[PDB]
Write a protein that binds this ligand. Sequence first.
Ligand SMILES: *[C@@H]1O[C@H](CO)[C@@H](O[C@@H]2O[C@H](CO)[C@@H](O)[C@H](O)[C@H]2NC(C)=O)[C@H](O)[C@H]1NC(C)=O
Ligand SMILES: *[C@@H]1O[C@H](CO)[C@@H](O[C@@H]2O[C@H](CO)[C@@H](O)[C@H](O)[C@H]2NC(C)=O)[C@H](O)[C@H]1NC(C)=O
Ligand SMILES: *[C@@H]1O[C@H](CO)[C@@H](O[C@@H]2O[C@H](CO)[C@@H](O)[C@H](O)[C@H]2NC(C)=O)[C@H](O)[C@H]1NC(C)=O
Ligand SMILES: *[C@@H]1O[C@H](CO)[C@@H](O)[C@H](O)[C@H]1NC(C)=O
Ligand SMILES: *[C@@H]1O[C@H](CO)[C@@H](O)[C@H](O)[C@H]1NC(C)=O
Ligand SMILES: *[C@@H]1O[C@H](CO)[C@@H](O)[C@H](O)[C@H]1NC(C)=O
Lengths: 50, 113, 49, 197, 123
Amino acid sequence: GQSKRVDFCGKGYHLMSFPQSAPHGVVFLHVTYVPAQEKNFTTAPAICHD
Amino acid sequence: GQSKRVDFCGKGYHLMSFPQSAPHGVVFLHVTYVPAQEKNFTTAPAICHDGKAHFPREGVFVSNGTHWFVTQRNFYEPQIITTDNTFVSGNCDVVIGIVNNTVYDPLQPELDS
Amino acid sequence: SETKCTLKSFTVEKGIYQTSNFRVQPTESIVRFPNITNLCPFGEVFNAT
Amino acid sequence: MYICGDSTECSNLLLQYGSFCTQLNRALTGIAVEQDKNTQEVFAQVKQIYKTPPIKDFGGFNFSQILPDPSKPSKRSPIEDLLFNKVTLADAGFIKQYGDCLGDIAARDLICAQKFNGLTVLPPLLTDEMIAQYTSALLAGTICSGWTFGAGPALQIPFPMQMAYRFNGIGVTQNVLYENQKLIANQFNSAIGKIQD
Amino acid sequence: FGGVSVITPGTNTSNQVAVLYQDVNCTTWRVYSTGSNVFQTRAGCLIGAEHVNNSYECDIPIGAGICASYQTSQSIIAYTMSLGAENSCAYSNNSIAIPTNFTISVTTEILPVSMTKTSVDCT
Ligand SMILES: *[C@@H]1O[C@H](CO)[C@@H](O[C@@H]2O[C@H](CO)[C@@H](O)[C@H](O)[C@H]2NC(C)=O)[C@H](O)[C@H]1NC(C)=O
Ligand SMILES: *[C@@H]1O[C@H](CO)[C@@H](O[C@@H]2O[C@H](CO)[C@@H](O)[C@H](O)[C@H]2NC(C)=O)[C@H](O)[C@H]1NC(C)=O
Ligand SMILES: *[C@@H]1O[C@H](CO)[C@@H](O[C@@H]2O[C@H](CO)[C@@H](O)[C@H](O)[C@H]2NC(C)=O)[C@H](O)[C@H]1NC(C)=O
Ligand SMILES: *[C@@H]1O[C@H](CO)[C@@H](O)[C@H](O)[C@H]1NC(C)=O
Ligand SMILES: *[C@@H]1O[C@H](CO)[C@@H](O)[C@H](O)[C@H]1NC(C)=O
Ligand SMILES: *[C@@H]1O[C@H](CO)[C@@H](O)[C@H](O)[C@H]1NC(C)=O
């Protein structure tokens, strides 16, 4: 599945995971989306048209 | 509530549950939705109309033997691909696997009539 | 008082405490031996020629 | 074995409280049962075994370090082979023969010392090969049909559309994925390589 | 030196048992008896069970992939357990499967909530 629980399936936004076998346990490879370059913009809650 | 946790409230997509009493414990009856009959369709990531690239808003582009339709992801109910079922982003030279089809425009016939 | 002794306190807070068990005492004793009237042969065992 | 060591006089005295030994073993048996149960709950979730696909172009997405390596005696993925080589177990296999412990006395092997005092290690029900097969089925399922194999029947989907759905699922419109497909696939492939290292 | 366990069908069915010798290789074996039906596995030398080449679902687990059951003229057999049904899909870059119908399923989950409450008078 695709969990929405924060930091449950790794840091960042979860996309998918792949298990791997290990002696006496399991290892998960968690693939996540992480925001990178960003810019600062002016903002507003609403637009006044007519 | 209605949990979205996979296989938490039973296998399949959870709709609702009903508890029942039991000695020393609880028994849950979990009602889930399960996909049944299915069909194989040809697909594409985008539609190329007038050179612009059209993507589904809430669905997938699906083709039968001769025509392209857009359907909701979990249920086969074909709709005509129109400008109200898609959004436009970029153009036909970027998306890998861009089929060309007509994206019906519901306004033009009114402007013509 | 049994609760107070168990808790080692002269003060008991609100709640339910288990307090030992209901017990009764014996009132009399019974002795039942076979009705043997002969004395053992102490003479024969210890006074033998 | 642990307490008396085959001394007959001790054994006969031990019987004075033999209900104790029975109780100790009920407790250990219960633990052993749970260990096999725990393994199945984590790995044997899907009883439908999907085979690892021929490697096809998945849209630039390279899964070779997570999928089984068919050239090896044990079809472990490159990552799994590394994980297994790094964790060290007490011994190899569950058969230790009397004649091996009798011959190698000078060796002072701790495993024989434990066995002669009544301490035994039992084998797992699922072997490493069996665990690898469950893992492979889950990976084959995910790559071929995404999450649908969990929900019910598996429904095939192009890998890149599976990714589009996953992007919409985090609040990023799918046109981003298709427009940047080469970049996304390259970053993915790079990240997996870094993990094995 | 140890290593012995017994595989039993219920005694209300039969009195045949198989005995596993955990530390015996069998390939004068430090066993109580033979009588053929000797199968060697990673979990030990199993004496008193017929090896079967068919996989089945697990009934009495033995260990290391081997399970046993009582089956037909019934006797104890041993086999490698099945891990599940073979299934398949056909990954393709241009096709999708889409559900056309659905079913409503109701399943049952059972959980303990509480245990017996006790009190003990040590005297
Ligand atoms: C794909 O779907 C279309 C739309 O339902 C099918 O075309 C229609 O077929 C009916 C007869 O069953 C005609 O009366 C309609 O006029 C057709 N519509 C159009 C636009 O031509 C089409 O046959 C289906 N293709 C295949 C291969 O089954
Ligand atoms: C997936 O990535 C691996 C590398 O992790 C690729 O394997 C390498 O291929 C080059 C060129 O043939 C060889 O020189 C290397 O020795 C290979 N490395 C390893 C570890 O095998 C593999 O070809 C890529 N798969 C696909 C489908 O592109
Ligand atoms: C967004 O980030 C990626 C890196 O994750 C940038 O891609 C790299 O760009 C440099 C400069 O052209 C190349 O030398 C690298 O080879 C690229 N990396 C990969 C994996 O392709 C990308 O240019 C950034 N882009 C924006 C804001 O458009
Ligand atoms: C032994 O004999 C004497 C008399 O000579 C007597 O006084 C004594 O009580 C006798 N002992 C026992 C045990 O009867
Ligand atoms: C039993 O001994 C043989 C050598 O005769 C060996 O090949 C085999 O692996 C051993 N069996 C087990 C379960 O280790
Ligand atoms: C699928 O792969 C084949 C090559 O095996 C290629 O010819 C075809 O154009 C590809 N289709 C899509 C939608 O990527």
